[PDB]
Each structure stands twice: as C-alpha cells, then as structure tokens.
Amino acid sequence: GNATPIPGYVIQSSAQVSDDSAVSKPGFPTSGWYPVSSRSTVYAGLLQNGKYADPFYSTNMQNVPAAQFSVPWWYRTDLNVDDTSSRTYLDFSGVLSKADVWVNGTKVATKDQVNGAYTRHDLDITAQVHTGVNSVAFKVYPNDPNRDLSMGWIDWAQTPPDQNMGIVRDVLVRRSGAVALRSAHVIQKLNSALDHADLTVKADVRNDSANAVQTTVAGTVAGKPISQTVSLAAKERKTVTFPLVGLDRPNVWWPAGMGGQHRYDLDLTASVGGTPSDAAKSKFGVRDVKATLNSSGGRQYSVNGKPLLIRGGGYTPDLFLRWNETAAADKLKYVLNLGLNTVRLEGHIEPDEFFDIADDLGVLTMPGWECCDKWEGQVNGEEKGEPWVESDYPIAKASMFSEAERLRDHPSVISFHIGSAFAPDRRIEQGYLDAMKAADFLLPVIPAASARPSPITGASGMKMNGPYDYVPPVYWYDKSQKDRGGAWSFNSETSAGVDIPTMDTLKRMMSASELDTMWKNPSAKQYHRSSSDTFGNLKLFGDALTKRYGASANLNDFVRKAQLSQYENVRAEFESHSRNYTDSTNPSTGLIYWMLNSPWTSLHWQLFDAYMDQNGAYYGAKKANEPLHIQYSHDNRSVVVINQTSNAVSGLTATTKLYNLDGTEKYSNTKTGLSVGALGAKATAVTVPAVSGLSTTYLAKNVLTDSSGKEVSRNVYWLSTKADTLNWGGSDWYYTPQSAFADLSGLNNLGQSAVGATANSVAGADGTTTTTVTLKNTSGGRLPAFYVDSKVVDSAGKPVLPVEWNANAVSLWPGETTTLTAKYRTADLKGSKPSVRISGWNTGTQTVPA
Ligand SMILES: N[C@H]1[C@H](Oc2ccc([N+](=O)[O-])cc2)O[C@H](CO)[C@@H](O)[C@@H]1O
Numbered sequence: 001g002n003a004t005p006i007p008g009y010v011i012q013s014s015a016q017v018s019d020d021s022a023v024s025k026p027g028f029p030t031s032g033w034y035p036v037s038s039r040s041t042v043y044a045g046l047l048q049n050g051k052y053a054d055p056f057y058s059t060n061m062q063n064v065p066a067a068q069f070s071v072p073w074w075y076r077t078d079l080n081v082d083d084t085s086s087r088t089y090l091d092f093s094g095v096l097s098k099a100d101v102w103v104n105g106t107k108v109a110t111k112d113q114v115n116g117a118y119t120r121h122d123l124d125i126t127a128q129v130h131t132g133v134n135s136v137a138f139k140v141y142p143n144d145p146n147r148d149l150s151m152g153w154i155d156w157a158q159t160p161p162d163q164n165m166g167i168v169r170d171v172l173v174r175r176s177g178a179v180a181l182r183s184a185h186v187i188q189k190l191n192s193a194l195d196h197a198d199l200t201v202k203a204d205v206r207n208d209s210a211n212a213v214q215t216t217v218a219g220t221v222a223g224k225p226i227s228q229t230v231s232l233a234a235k236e237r238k239t240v241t242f243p244l245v246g247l248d249r250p251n252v253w254w255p256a257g258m259g260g261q262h263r264y265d266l267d268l269t270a271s272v273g274g275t276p277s278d279a280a281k282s283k284f285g286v287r288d289v290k291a292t293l294n295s296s297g298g299r300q301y302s303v304n305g306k307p308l309l310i311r312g313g314g315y316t317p318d319l320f321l322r323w324n325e326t327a328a329a330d331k332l333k334y335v336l337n338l339g340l341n342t343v344r345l346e347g348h349i350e351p352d353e354f355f356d357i358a359d360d361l362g363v364l365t366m367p368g369w370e371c372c373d374k375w376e377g378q379v380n381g382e383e384k385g386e387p388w389v390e391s392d393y394p395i396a397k398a399s400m401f402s403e404a405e406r407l408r409d410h411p412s413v414i415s416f417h418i419g420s421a422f423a424p425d426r427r428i429e430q431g432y433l434d435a436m437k438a439a440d441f442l443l444p445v446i447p448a449a450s451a452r453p454s455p456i457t458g459a460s461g462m463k464m465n466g467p468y469d470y471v472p473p474v475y476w477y478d479k480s481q482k483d484r485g486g487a488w489s490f491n492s493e494t495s496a497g498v499d500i501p502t503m504d505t506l507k508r509m510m511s512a513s514e515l516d517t518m519w520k521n522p523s524a525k526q527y528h529r530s531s532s533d534t535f536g537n538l539k540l541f542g543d544a545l546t547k548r549y550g551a552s553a554n555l556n557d558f559v560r561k562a563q564l565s566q567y568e569n570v571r572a573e574f575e576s577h578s579r580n581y582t583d584s585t586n587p588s589t590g591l592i593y594w595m596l597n598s599p600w601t602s603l604h605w606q607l608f609d610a611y612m613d614q615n616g617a618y619y620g621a622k623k624a625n626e627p628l629h630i631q632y633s634h635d636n637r638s639v640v641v642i643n644q645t646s647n648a649v650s651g652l653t654a655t656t657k658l659y660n661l662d663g664t665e666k667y668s669n670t671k672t673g674l675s676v677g678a679l680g681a682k683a684t685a686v687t688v689p690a691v692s693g694l695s696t697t698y699l700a701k702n703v704l705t706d707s708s709g710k711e712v713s714r715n716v717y718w719l720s721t722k723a724d725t726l727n728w729g730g731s732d733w734y735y736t737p738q739s740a741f742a743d744l745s746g747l748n749n750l751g752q753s754a755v756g757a758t759a760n761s762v763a764g765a766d767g768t769t770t771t772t773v774t775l776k777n778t779s780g781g782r783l784p785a786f787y788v789d790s791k792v793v794d795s796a797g798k799p800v801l802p803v804e805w806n807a808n809a810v811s812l813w814p815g816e817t818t819t820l821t822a823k824y825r826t827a828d829l830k831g832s833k834p835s836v837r838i839s840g841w842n843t844g845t846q847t848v849p850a
Helices: 042-048 325-337 352-361 392-407 426-438 473-477 503-509 512-520 539-549 555-582 616-624 745-749
Strands: 003-005 008-013 034-037 073-081 087-092 099-103 106-109 121-124 132-140 171-176 179-190 196-207 213-221 224-232 237-241 245-248 264-272 275-284 289-293 299-303 306-308 310-314 342-346 364-368 489-494 588-593 628-632 638-643 649-660 665-676 681-687 697-705 711-720 738-740 755-763 768-777 785-793 810-812 817-825 835-840 844-849
Touching: 034 042, 106 121, 171 179, 171 275, 179 213, 179 264, 179 275, 196 213, 196 224, 196 264, 224 237, 224 245, 299 588, 310 364, 310 555, 325 352, 342 489, 352 364, 352 392, 392 426, 473 555, 503 555, 512 555, 539 555, 539 745, 555 588, 555 616, 555 628, 555 638, 555 681, 555 711, 555 785, 616 628, 628 649, 628 697, 628 711, 638 649, 638 665, 649 681, 665 681, 697 745, 711 810, 755 785, 755 835, 755 844, 768 785, 768 810, 768 835, 785 817, 810 817
Parallel strands: 310 342, 310 588, 342 364, 489 588
Antiparallel strands: 003 171, 008 034, 008 073, 073 132, 087 121, 087 171, 099 106, 099 132, 179 196, 196 237, 196 245, 213 224, 213 264, 264 275, 289 299, 299 306, 628 638, 638 681, 649 665, 649 697, 697 711, 755 768, 768 817, 785 810, 785 835, 835 844
16 A cells, blocks of 8 residues: 655766666666656756756856756656555656556566656566665656657746656556556536535556456445446456435535635545555545537636636646745645636646645635647647657657546646647547546546637637737727727736846846846846747837836846836736626626746746846735725726625725826725625726826726625726827737837836834744834825735845735825734744835835734
8 A cells, every 4th residue: 555755865976876776786887877756857967966057147057068968867766665565556657758667677668657846656676676776767768858758848937958858657566466446537527506526436447467356346436335346357447436425415516705615535445355455545536527609709717616707727737847835835825815716727737735735725616737848739830849650649649648647636627628729630539538438537628728629528628819929908808899809708827028027036046237128228138038040039128117207227227127117017917807807798707817827037028037026016916806806997098996805895985086296186986885796796886087187197096895895906097198009900920019108117216105104913823924014194295105016024134935925016195094914934033033015116115024
C-alpha cells in the first residue's frame, strides 16, 4: 500500500555521460551533478543551485546559454529497499518531453513509450529491484512545445532557456503484493432536489504475480462499508464495479459563497489471502454541473441547478514550473479576495494539489489543452505546431485518459476544453471522447474557446475575438460588433493588455534605465512584456494613457496614471459582463480576464503580479466583483445594482452624486426600495441625465446602502464630458483603435486633500495577523481624498505579501471615515512590527505604525 514520492534527484547533461547504462548502477559517481528537489525543470534545478542570476530581473534570462538544453539531461536517484517481498512500481507523469527509464543498469522503458507531459506510467520494476541500495535514472529529452504534446508558453512571456525539460510532477515508488490497486474513483449522481445521491465506486485490480488469485476490494465510501471479491488470472487486470450506494442528505459541494466545500472520502484496500496487498485513499465531491448552449447560442454553466455567470481569469503556473503548495493556495485565495468565481487553465494543467485546494476553497476550474503549438498542429494551418504523424495520436489519447482519470473526482472542475483556438478534427475529437468515456469523466466537454465548432460535440458557445491590447472602457459595453469582444456570449480570454505593476514590483524586475525607457518611450520593446512582435512593446497603452490622462512628467506620473487606467478598464470589462448577464437576447454568459496572473515578472495580462502584489488592475477587478455592487454604465449612463450572492436582497437604496473637481455637487439622485434577485441578477436605479456645467473631467460617486442603512458598496468613477469613441473599421484581431479619446487629464490638477490614518494589529492563534486601518478625510474644504491605497509594510517599508484586504483604493469625502482590514501570515512579517503605507492620488504618502 506504500506510494512514496522520490524527494529529489541529482541532474547533469548527457554531454557528460558516454555510457547510459552506467548511470542507474548503484555506486555511479555523480561529482559535479546538481541536487534538485522533486518537480524541477532542468533550469529550475540550475537556479536552485546558484548557477544563473534571477530571470525575474531585467534580461538575466537572455544570458543563459540555451544550446546545453538541446541534448538530454539525466535525473538520478538512489532508493533503499529493505525487503523485496513486495512488488515495486514507478508511477509518474510530468516528463517534458519524453524519457528513457533505467533501474540498476537495465533500461525498463524508452522515450517511445514514456512520451508526453500528461501521460501516466506505471512501470513494474520488480524484476530489477534488489535488497539494499538501488538506483533509478531518467534520461529526459529536450522539449519543443511545437513538436511535443507537452507545454509551451505561447506569447504570455519569454521562452524559458531549457523549454521546461525535466520532471515537473512526483515520481511515486509504489510497493504492493500480488495485486496492484489502481484508478479507484466514485461516480456520483445527485437528484435535482439535491437531497439524495447515488454513488458507484469503481476500482481496477491487476494481478502481477505468476499465479491466479482471489482478491477482495473492501473499505468505505462516504462512511459506508463496501466489499467485492473477484478472481484474477496471472497478469490479469479487471475493473471492479461496486453495487450502487445511496446517500441521503448529502453534504453537497458548492462554489464559494453558495454553501460549503465538503468532499467525501474513498478508502480501499485490495487483499489477497486475508492480507492487504495494496491500498488507495481519495476524495470526491457530490455536485452536478452542466454547460449548455442557451437560445442565443452562448455557453451557459450551472452548478447544482443554479445558472452562473463565469467571472474569472486565465491562470498560469511559474514560467519554470517551480512548484510550491502554499503559493498555489495563496494564488487561489486571491481569486476569492478578488470576488472572482473561476480560473481557466489553458494547458499547463497543475499537479493534483492545485485541484484539491480549488475544491477546498470553492474556486471553479476550467482546464483544457492549449492553442498555438503541437496540440492544435494538425488543425491550425500556418500557426506554430507541427502536423500530426501516426505516433502522435496514441500519445494525445493517453494524455486525455490520464488527465480525465486525474480530474474526474475534483468538484471544482466544471469542464474540459478539448480545443482552444481550433476545435479538434473528427479523428482527434473521437480519441478524446473515447478516452474520457474510458475514464468515466462525465463533465462538460467544450470543443473550443473560440467560436469554432467540432464535428461531434458541435458549437462551442464561446468566442475569442480579442481584444488583448488597449481599448477604452466603453468598448466592453458593445453588443453591435459581432466579430469583437463586447459583453455578450462567453468571453473565454480577453483584456485591454498592459498592466503595469506596483512601483515596488517594478524596481525588483527592471533596471533604472529599463524603467526610464518604459515611461519616455512606450513604443520601445520590453523584455518583460512578450516575445510576440505584436505584444513586444507598450505603444497602444502609452498612446492612450497620454491622450486620456495627459503626458507623463516622470516615471512616478506614468505609474500613477497607469494604475487609474488599469482600475478603470478592468472594472468596466467585468461590470459590462455582469450587467449583460440577464439580457434576454445575447446575454454575456462568461468572462475570463486575460490573465489572472503571469508566469513571471510582467508588464501585461495580470491582475496580481509574480510577487503577489496588488495594483490598479487588481483593485478594479475586486471593485467590479463585490457581492452587492453598485456600478455606472459607460455606454448609456445607467446606474445598476448587481447581487452576486445566493439570496435575493430587498429595501436597497442607490445614491448617485456627480461632483466637479472643485468639489461642487452637480447632481444627486436617491433611489430607495430596490430589490435584486440572487446569483447575478440586476436592478437599474436611475439613468444619469446630461448634466449642464460639469468640469471636463468630473466624478461620479455611487453608494449602495442596505435596509439597515449600512453602506455595502461604494464606486467612484472619474468621467469625461468628452467621449471615448471607436474606429470599428480599423479593428484588428487583438484591438480596436479609437476615433476619439476621453479627456481625464483634469485629475492632474485635482487640488490636495488630507487623510486621516490610524492602524492596529492582532496576531491570531491561527498563525495570521489582522491589521485594521481607520482612514478619515480630515481636510477643511470640499475636496475628496481620491484613490487612497493602503499597504501593509515592514519597518523597511517593503510590502508584506501575500495580503488580503476587505476593501482598498478607496475615496472619501470630507469628514468621511472608513475602516479597512488586511490579513496575512504573521511569519511573512519576518520579525518586523507591521506598519501601513498610505498613498492617495491627491493626498501624498505617509506611513503609520500598526
Ligand atoms: N488562446 C490564445 C489566443 O489565441 C488566439 C489564436 C488566434 C486568434 N485569432 O486568429 O483571432 C486569436 C487568439 O491568443 C492570445 C493572444 O495572442 C494568447 O495569449 C492565448 O493563449
């Protein structure tokens, strides 16, 4: 019943190994080999040892010779075996791209068999294993994402020098008797009332001994005892199906905010001769999911019978696939701190623990294959990725079986994308559907994340029309352009491009001269944007920032304007889709922001940066996604209330006020007695009229109060009397140019205000600290304290990260007070007392003790 991951390896280039057979012989010398932990790419292993500077800074990654990664590298380990009575197996996946496998001088598997990142291998090495010191070695071949059914980085970042070659999941050493237990899972089916489920337990037993046996498979499913006895011929594998098990009042799994995140346990042992031979423990959730096309042709998800608007981001692992379990949890927790409900994984499908965490937190996941490389090479024409040859087909199908077997019992998974870009052809699709059936993977299959249909499954119900680069806030409210990215159908991957991180992050990833070029010449190429020619620079972003904000006087000026622009755009992107969700015709049914995060330190396509810091894009997404939310429509000036929560809400008041930048109120409307339905429904409070006398740049202050009088949402917009307008005829695949630009440059001369700050911290018994900050606009005039950003810092003024605030980037009118709460691990203070840095657009910067 043992399965123990190999904790580490020593690695070296095959340039240093003239005899392959020598490596896995006990006693082979490994002087100058690099010790690496489990789940290391070659380059990640070299970084672990010294060997190159931080690729997260400047052009360090460019200085790595890539030629050394065009030959195989060895991953070698010893294994102590005290007792060879039990059979021994190597059970693994995550090999990029393929490998020969050696035990004690014998090649047990070749790169023709061990091939493809997602394929699982269960190699019986019993005949090679002896008592005492054994040795195992993998010769890992170079990875080319265009040639290998593997992982590549598309245009998200820059290419890792080793192209991620290595072993990026665990290799398990399994020990068992005559019978191996494998692939234990639970088929679960809930009634529509959600008060009764039926559980079908299935498990494979394989008799690897020389003689026929009887084996009993027995244990517990969801607290209920189960047992089957089968006969097995020598070398026979069988799937055991247990009689149906009913479960009353099941603890149903819900997405975060809709109920609990319970998972039941499955615990089985296969016994031979009244003695345990092998054992397996797993979990599953009792949850129904569906994803169907609505009458308008949009893909509509529902969980447990409740339709949902998908509100998420494209998730990526680290650029060098460096795995850390706490980091994965910190990233999924930020999803909820954002108010988001979903992450999409375009390829790069994370180890099991990532899905365990998403299960435990109630974050929905959308895994699938990626575009623009080998996966779509048979159907994607002139795009990157090679045509398929006959040997490709069984690798892809085994990759599908393996991932379907891994993912089937994680309730967070709401679908699998079998295509991205292009839907698979009939042959490929059939092999994917066959593999999923064989795995009992019963979740929705989506053919493409674009509008392209597959021959069997059919219409995707999704769109990939862009944009991926600057478009003004009003763009997102478009429904008229059927080949563009407005708020209708399922937006599977879209953003307004550039997302300048915080200054603290900037100073860690770029030199002073790289930063100087960034603000002085946005048209210049930035290594920390993209290898793509199209996304190599920040020109569209820089042009609109100047036009709309005003020319940047310095680096500080550029970064501050970037944050407002990013907050403004990301907010409108999400808010437009929340609004249109309940449209009768062509509703929005999903939005995946491109992207949630970056593989590395980046200037684009992120909400949170590589260090987990939180900028304007972060705060703007968090504002748009709050559970009871008030918002302003950029297209028609409607003020709209959204209720994300699982219950209808009544007696809400929506209060909207316009102010000139001198603080003069120019309009007020108070709309009382609003009711809004659950799970994404809306109510319109008012349409703001054209108001005479507004400054060119003006403020809209929107406030939602419940029936108790509590303020539950505040949303402040900086607006212009001059419209952003689109030149739709100049549209390209990744953006639409503007025919005219809003004028928000009035903010440059917004007069100074004042805050107003007191902070205190409590170190909890759960290992976390909560810092509470009370901020007040203490000025003596009519000016708001606008866009006030509070940051937990140590004594050196460095941000404590990760961190989760209840609210931030707040605006307060004179005399107004807000109390804010930040939570973080006490240990991330690293012994420092906490302080709070408070910076506002028109309030300066101060830091206070906490
Ligand atoms: N799925 C990818 C998406 O792929 C596309 C392929 C073709 C078209 N097209 O021809 O309109 C549009 C998008 O492109 C994004 C931006 O380049 C990538 O970052 C995503 O990973």
